[PDB]
Design an enzyme around this catalytic site. Structure first.
Site, PDB file in Angstrom:
ATOM      1  N   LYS A  47       2.864   6.799   5.402  1.00 35.68           N
ATOM      2  CA  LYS A  47       2.000   5.799   4.721  1.00 35.68           C
ATOM      3  C   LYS A  47       2.524   4.400   5.071  1.00 35.68           C
ATOM      4  O   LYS A  47       3.747   4.183   5.030  1.00 35.68           O
ATOM      5  CB  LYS A  47       2.198   6.007   3.209  1.00 35.68           C
ATOM      6  CG  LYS A  47       1.355   4.977   2.375  1.00 35.68           C
ATOM      7  CD  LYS A  47      -0.136   5.416   2.517  1.00 35.68           C
ATOM      8  CE  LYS A  47      -1.046   4.226   2.273  1.00 35.68           C
ATOM      9  NZ  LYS A  47      -1.003   3.221   3.376  1.00 35.68           N
ATOM     10  N   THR A  48       1.611   3.551   5.533  1.00 36.32           N
ATOM     11  CA  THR A  48       2.062   2.161   5.832  1.00 36.32           C
ATOM     12  C   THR A  48       1.939   1.285   4.609  1.00 36.32           C
ATOM     13  O   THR A  48       1.257   1.593   3.622  1.00 36.32           O
ATOM     14  CB  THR A  48       1.058   1.587   6.914  1.00 36.32           C
ATOM     15  OG1 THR A  48      -0.274   1.725   6.379  1.00 36.32           O
ATOM     16  CG2 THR A  48       1.179   2.349   8.187  1.00 36.32           C
ATOM     17  N   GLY A  49       2.319   0.014   4.753  1.00 38.07           N
ATOM     18  CA  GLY A  49       2.235  -0.956   3.690  1.00 38.07           C
ATOM     19  C   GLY A  49       2.416  -2.353   4.289  1.00 38.07           C
ATOM     20  O   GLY A  49       3.131  -2.502   5.270  1.00 38.07           O
ATOM     21  N   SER A  97       0.800  -1.242   0.000  1.00 34.61           N
ATOM     22  CA  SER A  97       0.000   0.000   0.000  1.00 34.61           C
ATOM     23  C   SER A  97       0.823   1.277   0.000  1.00 34.61           C
ATOM     24  O   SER A  97       0.209   2.375  -0.028  1.00 34.61           O
ATOM     25  CB  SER A  97      -0.961   0.060   1.180  1.00 34.61           C
ATOM     26  OG  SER A  97      -2.144  -0.619   0.910  1.00 34.61           O
TER      27      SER A  97
END
Lengths: 237, 237
Positions: free
Chosen positions: B176-178, B47
């Site tokens: 922003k995570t992923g 993501s």
């Protein structure tokens, strides 16, 4: 039309404060207030004028872009920094750089209050004849939120981001204080808190002002409106 | 050249995680990392690909503007909401409307990792062949921060504001995570946390990734970098 909400007066009565909260859901056509009369009364904007001023600063090129650094030993400030502190000199300097004729023109395009900048180009919003109401603050913030002011969308975006004061997974709060100074009780000073909250796909616009005769009551300008918005489930307590 | 800060490894050993953290002050020309070898290794973006995807979606007009609302009976999401939650179908739709040819063009303009979007137009960053390193993430965020990406300044600023995740008087964190999932025996998943902190007039870019085979370790993708940056006095709290 603006409707009156008597329940909100309890938060004012709790602290024995005279003032007004205007809160609008989605647009300025759906507003509510504890004090009909006061919502339309115009008061000196004080540091809430940093909002139009930063927009006009960018638009005229006095503020180069979002990365502009401001000099006040004196640590320099970002645009968000200059907005938050009492950078009395920062925004006095930006107004002088913009100058009377350009400032007047932009306040007329923004429909900003009584549009009277008499009293000194570097002090009119602090010591001058400029006045604006709580209702006119919300309408102006709504135009900013919709990028409808007469300025590039990029400069309105830059000032919107610089106004972010609280972020949560569900919402971002954009807000700005202001305080004229204590005054006398023949002429009480005025404190403000204005802004908007993007919560999910919803938006709420707000504008608070109060009479203030002692610096110790300054916090109320944020706690009262925060208690009201917390009650409506807009932001956390 | 990037310097190797041996000591950061202690935060990784404390949690028995294998990963890399890259943190740069002012520009990608002053970066440090716990491990030079893994700083350059490309991993699936998962993501974190919502960043480029959002800019490309605005740039192509698939996303109308900042006020665009996405359908998930779950309520619709804003751009910030769709960025933060798993709304995998949202970004899948965006990629489908952008299409393969324009997607390839924008990843080249962005110098985005290996730029391999082969396989499904709607799954390449989730389970396909696209890979990017932690250093490459930092270079890309720096380009976005400077408005140097091949896209309008407005669209860059709209994405940057949707990434705000923490706001304090002194700084704003955009992040922003992923998380690619838990993977297998010889092929664990990857978890990320990339972003930048605007603190006063300084800016720090960061990019973290780790191997992950159990969903219970997911919060370390934020606590390990937070611990490191707080130690450096950037965000503490």
């Amino acid at each position: 039309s603006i409707t009156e909400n008597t329940s909100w007066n309890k938060e004012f009565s709790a602290e024995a404060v005279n003032g007004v909260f205007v809160l609008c859901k989605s647009s300025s056509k759906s507003c509510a207030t504890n004090n009909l009369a006061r919502a339309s009364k115009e008061y000196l904007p004080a540091s809430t004028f940093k909002i139009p001023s930063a927009i006009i600063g960018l638009e005229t090129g006095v503020i180069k872009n979002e990365h502009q650094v401001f000099k006040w030993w004196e640590r320099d400030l970002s645009l968000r920094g200059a907005i938050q502190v009492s950078a009395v000199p920062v925004f006095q300097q930006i107004a002088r750089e913009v100058g009377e004729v350009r400032m007047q023109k932009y306040l007329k395009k923004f429909s900003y209050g009584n549009q009277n900048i008499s009293g000194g180009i570097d002090k009119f919003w602090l010591e001058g004849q400029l006045r604006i109401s709580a209702v006119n603050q919300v309408e102006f913030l709504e135009s900013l939120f919709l990028n409808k002011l007469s300025a590039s969308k990029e400069n309105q975006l830059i000032v919107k981001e610089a106004l972010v004061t609280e972020a949560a997974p569900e919402y971002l709060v954009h807000s700005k204080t202001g305080f004229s100074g204590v005054g006398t009780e023949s002429n009480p000073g005025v404190a403000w808190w204005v802004g908007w909250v993007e919560k999910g796909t919803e938006v709420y616009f707000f504008a608070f002002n109060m009479d203030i005769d002692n610096e110790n009551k300054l916090p109320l300008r944020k706690s009262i409106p925060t208690k009201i918005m917390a009650s409506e489930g807009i932001i956390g307590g």
